Amino acid sequence: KIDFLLSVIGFAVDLANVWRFPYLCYKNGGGAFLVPYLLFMVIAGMPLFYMELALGQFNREGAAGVWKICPILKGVGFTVILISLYVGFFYNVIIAWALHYLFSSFTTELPWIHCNNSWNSPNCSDAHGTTPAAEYFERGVLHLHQSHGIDDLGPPRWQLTACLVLVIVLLYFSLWVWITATMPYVVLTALLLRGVTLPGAIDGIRAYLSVDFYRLCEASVWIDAATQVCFSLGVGFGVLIAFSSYNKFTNNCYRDAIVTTSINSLTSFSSGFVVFSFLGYMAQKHSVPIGDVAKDGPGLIFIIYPEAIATLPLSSAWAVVFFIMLLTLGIDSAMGGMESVITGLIDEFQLLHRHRELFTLFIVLATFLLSLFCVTNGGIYVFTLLDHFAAGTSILFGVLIEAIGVAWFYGVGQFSDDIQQMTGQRPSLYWRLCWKLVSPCFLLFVVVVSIVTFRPPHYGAYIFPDWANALGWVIATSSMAMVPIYAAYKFCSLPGSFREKLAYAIAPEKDRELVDRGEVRQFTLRHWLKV
Ligand SMILES: Fc1ccc(C(OCCN2CCN(CCCc3ccccc3)CC2)c2ccc(F)cc2)cc1
Ligand SMILES: *[C@@H]1O[C@H](CO)[C@@H](O)[C@H](O)[C@H]1NC(C)=O
Numbered sequence: 001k002i003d004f005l006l007s008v009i010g011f012a013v014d015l016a017n018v019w020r021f022p023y024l025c026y027k028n029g030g031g032a033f034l035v036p037y038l039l040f041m042v043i044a045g046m047p048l049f050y051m052e053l054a055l056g057q058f059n060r061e062g063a064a065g066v067w068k069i070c071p072i073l074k075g076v077g078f079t080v081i082l083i084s085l086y087v088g089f090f091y092n093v094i095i096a097w098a099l100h101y102l103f104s105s106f107t108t109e110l111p112w113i114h115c116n117n118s119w120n121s122p123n124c125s126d127a128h129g130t131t132p133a134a135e136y137f138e139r140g141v142l143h144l145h146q147s148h149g150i151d152d153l154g155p156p157r158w159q160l161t162a163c164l165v166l167v168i169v170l171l172y173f174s175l176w177v178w179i180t181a182t183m184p185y186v187v188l189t190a191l192l193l194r195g196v197t198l199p200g201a202i203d204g205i206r207a208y209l210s211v212d213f214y215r216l217c218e219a220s221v222w223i224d225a226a227t228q229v230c231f232s233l234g235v236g237f238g239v240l241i242a243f244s245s246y247n248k249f250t251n252n253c254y255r256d257a258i259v260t261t262s263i264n265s266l267t268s269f270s271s272g273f274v275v276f277s278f279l280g281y282m283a284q285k286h287s288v289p290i291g292d293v294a295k296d297g298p299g300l301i302f303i304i305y306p307e308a309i310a311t312l313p314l315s316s317a318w319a320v321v322f323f324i325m326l327l328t329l330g331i332d333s334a335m336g337g338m339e340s341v342i343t344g345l346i347d348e349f350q351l352l353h354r355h356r357e358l359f360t361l362f363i364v365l366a367t368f369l370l371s372l373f374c375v376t377n378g379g380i381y382v383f384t385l386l387d388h389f390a391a392g393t394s395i396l397f398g399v400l401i402e403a404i405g406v407a408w409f410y411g412v413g414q415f416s417d418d419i420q421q422m423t424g425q426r427p428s429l430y431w432r433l434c435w436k437l438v439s440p441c442f443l444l445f446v447v448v449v450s451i452v453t454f455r456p457p458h459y460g461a462y463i464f465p466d467w468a469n470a471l472g473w474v475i476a477t478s479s480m481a482m483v484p485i486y487a488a489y490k491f492c493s494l495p496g497s498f499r500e501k502l503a504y505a506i507a508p509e510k511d512r513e514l515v516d517r518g519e520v521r522q523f524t525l526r527h528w529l530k531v
């Protein structure tokens, strides 16, 4: 009842709809990003959500223990864990920035209002060049002007290192909801009501709701939309399976999938609406076009929202409340992502059941030491590289392998009966077709297009060198290469001839009685042709 609805709210809003979605909408065409996003959502965001929810609820294992249905494909369980670790590495930095801004908001005069300060260049325009908020961010919080690229980083900054330490301590002691869940909705509604009334908001709304029919012919908005759907829904991170492994057996995993995706899409739409409504007003007030008012990067919202707060009556209170909300949202997301990895590695190995605090300490210390790279002078370059290369092709490859392993090796007709065991009904033809044919081919197309059509990352005008791209590709392939290695190890470890090795490697562990009598279900084509 109310506990069910309060659980949907927690999954409906996260840091991926407030921080990344508007920045990806602005980077691509305004309104040309909403067509691939909605198409990919409808096609392969509900089937995958349903699949992971049901798999976790039925097999009662975190991330790699659910692969008793196909022992040879356990490498995706480690791939998703590596992806989660990589994501958390740069996920901590956003919380550090939010803490910095929250501490800086306790003033009678906000520091990002005018440019008379010591961190301002002559190229600053006051309501007329660079805006005071972007200059304040870059040259007072990041100190980006002292870095000459990714090959020249410098020592870490002592102001942001303290925030990172505080975030790490809080996360560890939280890992070892009535107020925390309904605060972002109130804040976003208030911001939307404010931004609707601003003089130049209609132009931004029109640019947001207009679809450009020439930006859809480029193979970048599709990849961005697919990766953003994966980021927002949590598919491909190992989080949904781990969360659902604790749910009741006779739980309706279909209604949850139907409702959570709808509410998530509505929240994403509202966030983009607010951001573009403020962008239009800024562009009108600065006498510049909408596309030439900011840079495409993870500095949006951090540049926009302070300027929106500055126009409210008592701006200090609004700023404090907004940054507290952002801090809580980021903490929740990071703690969930880290708990996924911790529980997966605890379930996998047996010695660690006597190493709980001494394992969480190791994980958080490694995360802190790896996040220390992004608090240097040139940390935004490392942030951009990580954001481009940690997920994307690797996460889509992992999702494709998971879908293939569940729908072709185990069997969609057996998955349906497993669902019908816990819930009184079984999936219809639409769900089975989407699981078996529609989703895998689209995922394969997106993966192939992403690999063949490579676009180097950039931050405004800086173009990354060759070795940066090589290191990024190594980082991306490190998690992807976990499937063939485990497959080869599993094949070589099992005893018997080739046929017996294959039979024990592809058949489920609950079918050993049938396999021992020469009754392998995967040695006939009726099993592979059945939808
Ligand atoms: F095991 C679980 C325990 C708790 C939760 C809570 O949700 C967290 C919301 N997720 C949204 C999806 N994000 C995508 C990954 C990004 C990321 C970031 C850093 C490192 C790695 C990955 C992860 C976070 C929750 C909240 C209300 C509730 F009622 C129940 C659970 C989930 C699973
Ligand atoms: C900046 O400060 C100087 C000295 O305090 C002052 O003369 C100048 O007018 C200020 N700039 C603006 C735009 O007011």
Ligand SMILES: *[C@@H]1O[C@H](CO)[C@@H](O)[C@H](O)[C@H]1NC(C)=O
Binding pocket: 122, 123
């Ligand atoms: C700032 O403006 C001056 C002109 O007054 C210009 O010469 C300089 O290049 C500008 N700085 C930039 C664009 O970084």
